[PDB]
From a paper:
Humans have three different [name] ([name]) clamp-loading complexes: [name] and CTF18-[name] load [name] onto DNA, but [name]-[name] can only unload [name] from DNA. The eukaryotic DNA clamp is [name], a trimeric ring structure that encircles and slides along double-stranded DNA to promote processive DNA synthesis. We show here that [name] has two unique locking loops that appear to tie the complex into a rigid structure, and together with a domain that plugs the DNA-binding chamber, prevent conformation changes required for DNA binding, likely explaining why [name]-[name] is exclusively a [name] unloader. We obtained four cryo-EM structures of the [name]-[name]–[name] complex (intermediates states 1–3 and 3′), in which [name] is in different configurations that affect the ring opening and closing process during [name] unloading or during dissociation of [name]-[name] from [name] after unloading.
However, we obtained from the 3-min incubation mixture two other intermediate states (cracked-[name] intermediate 2 and disordered-[name] intermediate 3) of the [name]-[name]–[name] binary complex, at average resolutions of 3.5 Å and 3.1 Å, respectively. [name]-[name] does not undergo large conformational changes in these intermediates; in particular, the conformations of the unique features (such as LL1, LL2 and the plug) of [name] in these states are the same as in the planar-[name] intermediate state 1 that was obtained from the 20-min incubation sample. In the disordered-[name] intermediate state 3, [name]-1 and [name]-2 are well resolved, but [name]-3 is disordered and invisible. Unexpectedly, the [name] (subunit D) in the disordered-[name] and open-[name] intermediate states 3 and 3′ is occupied by ADP. By contrast, the ADP in [name] of states 3 and 3′ is stabilized by Val41, Thr85 and Arg239. Therefore, the ATPγS in [name] seems to have been either hydrolyzed to ADP or exchanged for ADP in the transition between the cracked-[name] and disordered-[name] intermediate states 2 and 3. Notably, we have captured an unprecedented intermediate of [name]-[name] in which both [name] (subunit D) and [name] (subunit E) are bound to ADP, in addition to the expected intermediates shared among all clamp loaders and unloaders in which only [name] (subunit E) is bound to ADP and all other subunits are bound to ATPγS. [name]-3 is made highly mobile by [name]-[name] in the intermediate with two ADP molecules, and a [name]-3/2 gap can form. In one scenario, the cracked-[name] intermediate 2 could occur just after the release of [name] from DNA, followed by ATP hydrolysis to yield the disordered and open intermediates 3 and 3′, which should have lower affinity to, and most easily disengage from, [name] owing to expenditure of binding energy (between [name]-[name] and [name]) used to open [name].
Author numbering:
A (entry chain E): 2 to 349
B (entry chain B): 178 to 351
C (entry chain D): 36 to 363
D (entry chain C): 1 to 339
E (entry chain A): 866 to 972, 1049 to 1098, 1119 to 1195, 1296 to 1418, 1451 to 1523, 1632 to 1844
The structure:
Amino acid sequence: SLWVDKYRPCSLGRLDYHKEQAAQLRNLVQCGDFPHLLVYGPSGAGKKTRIMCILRELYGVGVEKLRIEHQTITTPSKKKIEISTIASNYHLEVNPSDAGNSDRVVIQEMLKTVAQSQQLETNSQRDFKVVLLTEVDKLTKDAQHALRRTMEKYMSTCRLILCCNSTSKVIPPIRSRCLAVRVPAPSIEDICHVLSTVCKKEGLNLPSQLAHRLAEKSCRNLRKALLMCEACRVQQYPFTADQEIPETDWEVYLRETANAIVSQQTPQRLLEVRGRLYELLTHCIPPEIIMKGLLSELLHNCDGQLKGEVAQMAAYYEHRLQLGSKAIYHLEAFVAKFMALYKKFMED
Amino acid sequence: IEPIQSRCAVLRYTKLTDAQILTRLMNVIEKERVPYTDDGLEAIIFTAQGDMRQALNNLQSTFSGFGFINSENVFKVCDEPHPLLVKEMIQHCVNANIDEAYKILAHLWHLGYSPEDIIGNIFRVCKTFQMAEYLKLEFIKEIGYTHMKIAEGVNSLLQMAGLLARLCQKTMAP
Amino acid sequence: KPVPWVEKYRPKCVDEVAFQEEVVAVLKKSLEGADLPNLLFYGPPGTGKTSTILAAARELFGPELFRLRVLELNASDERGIQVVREKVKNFAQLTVSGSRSDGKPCPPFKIVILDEADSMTSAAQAALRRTMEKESKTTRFCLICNYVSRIIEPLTSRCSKFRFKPLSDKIQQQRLLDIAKKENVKISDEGIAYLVKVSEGDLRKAITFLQSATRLTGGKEITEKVITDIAGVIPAEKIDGVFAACQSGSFDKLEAVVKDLIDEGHAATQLVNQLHDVVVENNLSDKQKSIITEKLAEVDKCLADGADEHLQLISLCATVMQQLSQNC
Amino acid sequence: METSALKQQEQPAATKIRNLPWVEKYRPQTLNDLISHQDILSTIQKFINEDRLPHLLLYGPPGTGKTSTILACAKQLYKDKEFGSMVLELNASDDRGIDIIRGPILSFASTRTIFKKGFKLVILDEADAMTQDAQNALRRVIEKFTENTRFCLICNYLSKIIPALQSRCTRFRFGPLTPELMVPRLEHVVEEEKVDISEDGMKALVTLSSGDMRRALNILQSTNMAFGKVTEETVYTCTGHPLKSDIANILDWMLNQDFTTAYRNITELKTLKGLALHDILTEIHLFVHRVDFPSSVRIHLLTKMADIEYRLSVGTNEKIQLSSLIAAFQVTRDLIVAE
Amino acid sequence: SFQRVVHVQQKDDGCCLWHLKPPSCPLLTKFKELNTKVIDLSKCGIALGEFSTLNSKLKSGNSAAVFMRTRKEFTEEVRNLLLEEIRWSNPEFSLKKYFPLLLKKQITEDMLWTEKYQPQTASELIGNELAIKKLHSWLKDWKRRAELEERQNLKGKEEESRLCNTVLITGPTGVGKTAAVYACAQELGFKIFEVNASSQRSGRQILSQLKEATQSHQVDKQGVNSQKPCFFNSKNATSLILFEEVDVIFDEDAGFLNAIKTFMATTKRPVILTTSDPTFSLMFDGCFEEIKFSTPSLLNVASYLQMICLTENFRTDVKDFVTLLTANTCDIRKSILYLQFWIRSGGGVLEERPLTLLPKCDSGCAETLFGLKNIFSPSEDLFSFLKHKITMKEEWHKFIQLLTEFQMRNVDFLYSNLEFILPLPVDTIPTTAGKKCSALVSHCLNSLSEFMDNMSFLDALLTDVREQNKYGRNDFSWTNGKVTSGLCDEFSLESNDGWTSQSSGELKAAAEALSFTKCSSAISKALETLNSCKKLGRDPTNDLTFYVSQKRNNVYFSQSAANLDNAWKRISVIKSVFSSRSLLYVGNRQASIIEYLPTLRNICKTEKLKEQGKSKRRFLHYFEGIHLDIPKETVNTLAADFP
Ligand SMILES: Nc1ncnc2c1ncn2[C@@H]1O[C@H](COP(=O)(O)OP(=O)(O)OP(O)(O)=S)[C@@H](O)[C@H]1O
Ligand SMILES: Nc1ncnc2c1ncn2[C@@H]1O[C@H](COP(=O)(O)OP(=O)(O)OP(O)(O)=S)[C@@H](O)[C@H]1O
Ligand SMILES: Nc1ncnc2c1ncn2[C@@H]1O[C@H](COP(=O)(O)OP(=O)(O)O)[C@@H](O)[C@H]1O
Ligand SMILES: Nc1ncnc2c1ncn2[C@@H]1O[C@H](COP(=O)(O)OP(=O)(O)O)[C@@H](O)[C@H]1O
Ligand SMILES: [Mg+2]
Ligand SMILES: [Mg+2]
């Protein structure tokens, strides 16, 4: 229990930002027939805590207890797949993107069991059970078609909550029937407010300069800000205005990878950069995150006309990375094309 | 499954080289009084890509249908898109002649051949085509991209016309 | 217990629909002999195809039997075409006895409302053709589709084709005001104009958006901001900021603008749509419009494939910046 | 089981006072009546009559005359007094998994004849719908009982058949008919039915059917009852196909005026005629090779149009893809014209 | 009936678009006349070898090389020399205590080598010494309890002990779980009652036929006792129950889990559970002692197979065995069986290699393991084939066949061994002349970048034979990956495509071979000019070296370019960290590791650095001070560094 979940708000009245949206979601809940929700926004914005607040407003306090169960579903290709699940008496939470192209093997089946439970469990509180869908943006085309037919079939049976970061990959049929809840990232002052409130509730005091530095370093990620504040608490018992905020280890590793890319353009350096990217990939860092970090740390050393070409190359190879399966090929292909272009730029 | 492979010894078989299929074809021919020519042998070997059962079945079918083994008889009884037509189309694409290459492609399309066997025969002819290594690599890459597009579901003459053109612009552009 | 307004506020019967004259005439001539042929309704979405034929089925069949003898199916099933084939097969296999108390014997056929008919492959349409000719007399089909030209030859040659021309903005605003006054929600008429501008002629999306705004605001005034957040439309000042950053020619402010749009939660597909709508209706040169619109098409394709919104948007904005700075 | 009373009832089924089954009006009865694929039916007679009938693999586009052809061969080879006892016609319509292979086919193939001694035959329709392991069982059944029974696999696409099943059988492709030979039949049916068609409507019928007799009869019959006369506009409006005038005007807009006016006009025409971008791309591609373009212009247009057609398949915004289609012509042909 | 069909369109008068005519511009009116005249193929006859690799000349005498191998029995001296050679190859291996046991085992044949060299004594198990120590000790307490029961019975006429009545052994396939329990049972005189998936085991069946084995004595206590009666229904020896492959549950095995739980509650004799599914230990409820067989060390199993071949008068190198075990992912049984097949066929090839660290060595087992000897002539080496340029059609077909045989496994051969086969120096990790050297380096880098762009093209824009991430997500993932195989007898009934795999593999193989040929030819052309730069005095050969790992240099060829042990450790510590009770309820997975894990490692590293400076002891009370129930070895793992 770190500071990120010990002080997570439990009801819609305890939220500190997006208060108008919180009141709108409360009015949504009080109508009694709230629709499928499509909650989206950047990572660390506060989508999950708002969904939890909605769930605590819908049902009683009993949603606050959770339990983990494992479900083994037989694929139509006759190869059983077992997935984990967080659940309660009133709601289910699932992430079928873990099932690969067999995500529909979750989608057409799992919620069906919940629908079965909706004719098995009777509570006389509400006529539905909320199914939370995490990382619905990572589903495939046929998985989303299965989800569409599923919410058509069990509309009056269960309600759907779809949490994502980007609604670009989701189909327009899946958006045409869900109420869209856009949760933007909190501002700097809002992160400072949350950090000061969380430090006061713990009994410590942090200066406004340190809170502003943490909020600026978090890149409008509230969870990253809370984790960095906890790390600063670990480093020093009192909070000083000049206390060094510690940096992320894989981020600084990516920074030295970019420095090694820039420094020398040789096949040997290309092989060490490939080894570094393999080391990052073995740490379960997503390759899209690696590409974004590499582009962010390579555009500092670039020149104005080179920046557009480098950004377009990074986008091209990241789309190739999405299409392919072995991401090291696309990562190092972007890397090697960048060293070739950078060398050609530096010779002239 | 993996424990079954663990409890055994896995031995690997590969496709038969056309030399071996030719030797067995001569063995069957010399024990069956089958009149033949060299072009019919090349056609039978082409229609059976590394398969000995397909080679024997095509030889028997051509002997039963016409009684002589030449190329026109083999391709009358097997009905692939003709490798002479596909070779001429690929040669036109090497010379960046979109008009004649599309003339051959549209003639093949109006003969009722599917996209799948047309692109398969295009790849099979292009595998042994006599051109430079870089041009062969670009041709194979574009043929593979188009074949993947056909396999995904979009299989029209527009896709094949766009390939011939991506093949023409490989040579017409540096 | 309750039902959303988009199906519960449909026309009950034929000729209650609006802005269709020939369609209603031939439909009424079909209802007069109680002989409804195979139907093919094509037009823009939300034009009122489904409401019209559901009204026709309510005219033809009794309301206790109208739900029993119609079956709404979707053609974008990912499990193949044999699933909907066996579904219509065992829907028409059952012959449950029904009658009307008004003094008219019911016609024996059933109705299959098969929507998104233009999303079917040619083989799937051929399987549907063989299913329709199998069930030639026991059930007469209808196909709701967006475009008539996607439906292959044997199906389109035998179903009567009806075009649903899109409703104008004024009739849509009148209908939306009717819904607002009848449902007791207080919303100003310029907000309703904003609703019909945002939905872009999709009356069904407009009704759904109005219901969502009513049940999300809480009986207070529906401002344009609530509608904008519900529909996912990016406000025009963000688009103007993107274009100003591209016209500046500096990459850092372009990155700042793209990051500001990304961390606000705004979708990249909506931004691509609004940039395209801005670009195709400006005083740009033809070559600039061509390059920008081609790049927008490839960026839309890459975003559908799951590529990162930040990288795709910064590549598109770099292309737009180069196009806007190569002439100045 | 079953699924056989419907066809038996359907064969002598017509209202006979009002209905006009034009497709069922002109059907061949034997191999001397189907005037098409003369090489194929001749070599089938040559195979049957000398007692060397092999395993057959009949494929091709549907409606080319495969099932009725093999019905004619089965009826001319076996009399009606012994037809049902030694000819077994199944298909993939009756599928409960793969049990049909180890059930009816394996039982039928492994036993001798009952009444009249001879060789038996299995007809298997839409054999491409079988699974891979069902074909792997069928090839073993064919291999070990090739002397007793022969097999005839009627499929639509040859690419869905495993290589060993294709290796056991000789293949017959039923291609589309040279559009020219179809015309005599169309003049025959218009002379019989007393209808008014111009030569342009004839051209429309032979370019829409792509060498299919049944679809030609369907379209001609439907346009006849719809209008009473058939010209290209009348058939194309009843069919709901992109008219040649509409595609020519679309091409003229994309070649002549600017981006915005052409885009607005094409959007108006698409909403007006119910036209999709896929069929626009198909007809524009057909128009590209009949219009005198330079080779580089043609290559550029074909590459761009193929890219747009691929992009439409994954489910992108049709409006932006239409703008890219306009852009493909605006890149090359407009500045070629203005030079 | 036969109603008419009409196309009703709301065609209002006007709009300038409903009634349209062809345009009057001359560009779209002069339609080009279509011609169907194609060239005539009757006159053009097809020459031999035009579309294939057919040659008029044929090789005679080069093929059909019969071995006729008569392996002489090795003398004692050369046996001692080869034993010392394996001693040099494996300094940590104790060579002397294993050879006489295998000599006794070997001292016309009719059984497999897996049961010919079956370990009869538990110390002959290779690796997993903690697991076999725990199992041997546990069976010692159970035999002690059986002897105590016998002593109590003859005299008549347990939290502190914590002797749980069952263990669950889990591990990979073929590491030796069943061999370990059989060896321990033979050592301690147990009598194994094996219940496997090859026999009908329904719940009432196994209950009513095997409870009395646990609850009662054995009627025959002396004589022929240490046997293995496999249950089915179509010194004193203590009974033992073994449940082989418990994760395999069928519909006919009705209530098998309830039956084995009833066995668990009411037994008086030891019970072993053997499985290879890691999820079962989390799925099964009950108290059992967990025993995990980790994957054994590659050098130890390599020396064990070297012992096996040395006993059979065969001399081999450890590198070929390391390649074989890397390809077989350290499966001991699969390696032993393939070694038996390959040795009893007459070995690979007769080659001489002088090693002191003598009969001719027998390298080449991994080459014929993948069937590459079926493509190549027996005078052709694989890397010698890859290094030289390729011009003639027949060895082009050989290259294509090599790559497509390696492509059915979805394995990238030329990428995994790119350094060792490119014409560039490879080393294991421990002015106008400058313009010319930089130009050569840029040429090499451009060729490499073009090749690997082409390979990204192949990986993304071409069809793959096996559908990747079919049941899980892509590689290096922590959330799942435990996709067990099917357990049901009904068929798949799928609509997969077979043409788009057979053609796809050939297409990918051809494109990969062509791209590698282009890159290698360009690099060789660039290195042709290295003599001019060496004459100029500047040497960029160092800038041209390839720095590969030591473990990648131990193989003839690698199956992958990564470190699998590293990745398995990282995913394992991720599951270990996020299996903690407070962190089980974190919703997401991507941002969960991305944000939670590095600050956890940062807090661990700060705690370790604070404890390295001799501060107060209360500083070690941060993690459990806020109730982070996380195991300590994972905390020490996070506190080390970030690689
Ligand atoms: N070449 C042709 N000329 C005239 N009529 C034809 C021709 N081909 C087919 N037909 C008609 O099509 C009817 C049915 O033929 P079939 O053999 O069933 O067609 P098919 O090729 O097997 O394709 P199917 O059955 O639709 S999957 C015949 O009775 C004829 O009326
Ligand atoms: N560590 C080992 N030492 C010696 N021989 C071994 C070893 N591991 C496997 N073997 C040999 O390989 C054979 C098969 O081993 P098993 O114990 O059956 O494999 P396993 O651990 O049970 O995995 P399964 O049963 O395939 S899931 C044994 O009988 C031995 O001959
Ligand atoms: N109103 C708030 N007050 C205090 N803390 C908050 C508030 N909203 C969010 N947080 C904190 O920020 C983090 C947001 O994480 P999460 O809910 O998972 O959002 P996302 O799903 O977008 O990452 C939570 O750990 C929570 O503790
Ligand atoms: N012409 C019309 N007359 C009356 N109501 C209409 C008309 N067109 C649309 N609507 C209303 O708009 C909604 C459109 O729903 P639907 O019929 O599904 O549209 P479509 O079938 O065009 O997709 C319905 O709720 C209906 O009440
Ligand atoms: Mg047929
Ligand atoms: Mg075992």
